[PDB]
């Protein structure tokens, strides 16, 4: 996904590479529905 080519090895952990949201616990839909 995205303009990323590497597909073999990620060195740093995911948490330290990208932000993560904390839990609170082709086919394209149309942006308008007409009942």
């Amino acid at each position: 996904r995205g303009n990323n080519g590497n597909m073999t090895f990620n060195y740093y952990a995911n948490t330290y590479q990208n932000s993560v949201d904390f839990s609170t616990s082709g086919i394209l839909n149309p942006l308008g529905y007409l009942k």
């Binding site: 996904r1 995205g2 303009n3 990323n4 590479q17 990208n18 932000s19 082709g26 149309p30 942006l31 308008g32 529905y33 007409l34």
Partner: protein, 255 residues
């Protein structure tokens, strides 16, 4: 064919009237399009502890250090502060002080939505030959620490040390790193219509819509100040960008 566009929701090739269903052959994806570097702003380089600009309005005869620092945001900015009306000094020589301004032309050329969110990846490039420098950054809502301390009768600005990241690059080098989305607001409003304060506010001026602040300085004591100025360039990138609702596009003149 039969249709009713006044209702808004119109139906949906040549197979319908006369067909051709040319096979597919995803370069427009939001995540993919916005992943590439672009210039943001050009700033001076510090050589001593500086005094941050005062909030507007700034009266005549106020002592400060202007031209340094720079926000990290596509929205228009003036004097390193958030702004609404973009402007430039196309006029010839005048008086007073000229206010640095910035804007993301490429971002706004396709900013066709309202809300946005992504990670930012910063890098720095020097301009003058064989120049040595360093960078410092702090989150949104923080402040820049002033003053200096004495070591062996050398005045070292306080910004040499801090809990926020610092970067030292070799002679004629370059810097790069990726920062996290850290503002309090859930998403970045490309265009806004609210107010940030109960009274004396300005309509449509967001408060904390940015990624942080950046500045550049030389690793030397204050006792070795020079005369010739130096400059630095900045670039930014977006990672895992997302958009949340349609919008308009900039108007093109018919001249």
């Amino acid at each position: 064919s039969t249709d009713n566009a006044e209702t808004g929701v119109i139906e949906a090739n040549t197979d319908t009237d006369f067909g051709e269903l040319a096979a597919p052959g995803n370069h427009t994806n939001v995540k993919f399009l916005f992943d590439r570097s672009r210039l943001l702003n050009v700033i001076k380089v510090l050589e001593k502890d500086a005094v941050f600009p005062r909030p507007f309005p700034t009266q005549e005869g106020a002592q400060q250090d202007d031209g340094y620092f720079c926000l990290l945001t596509p929205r228009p900015t003036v004097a390193s502060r958030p702004a609404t009306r973009f402007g430039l000094y196309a006029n010839p020589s005048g008086s007073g002080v000229l206010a640095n301004t910035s804007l993301d032309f490429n971002f706004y050329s396709l900013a066709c939505f309202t809300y946005f969110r992504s990670d930012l990846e910063v890098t720095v490039v020097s301009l003058e030959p064989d120049l040595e420098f360093a960078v410092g950054w702090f989150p949104s809502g923080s402040e820049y620490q002033a003053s200096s301390f004495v070591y062996d009768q050398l005045h070292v600005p306080f910004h040499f040390t801090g809990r926020t990241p610092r970067a030292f690059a070799s002679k004629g080098g370059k810097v790069s790193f990726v920062l996290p989305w850290n503002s309090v607001s859930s998403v970045l409003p490309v265009r806004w219509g609210g107010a940030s304060k109960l009274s004396s506010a300005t309509r449509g001026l967001p408060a904390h819509a940015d990624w942080g602040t950046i500045y550049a300085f030389v690793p030397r004591p204050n006792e070795k100040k020079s005369t010739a100025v130096k400059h630095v360039a900045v670039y930014i990138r977006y990672k895992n960008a997302r958009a949340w609702c349609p919008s308009m596009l900039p108007f093109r003149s018919y001249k």
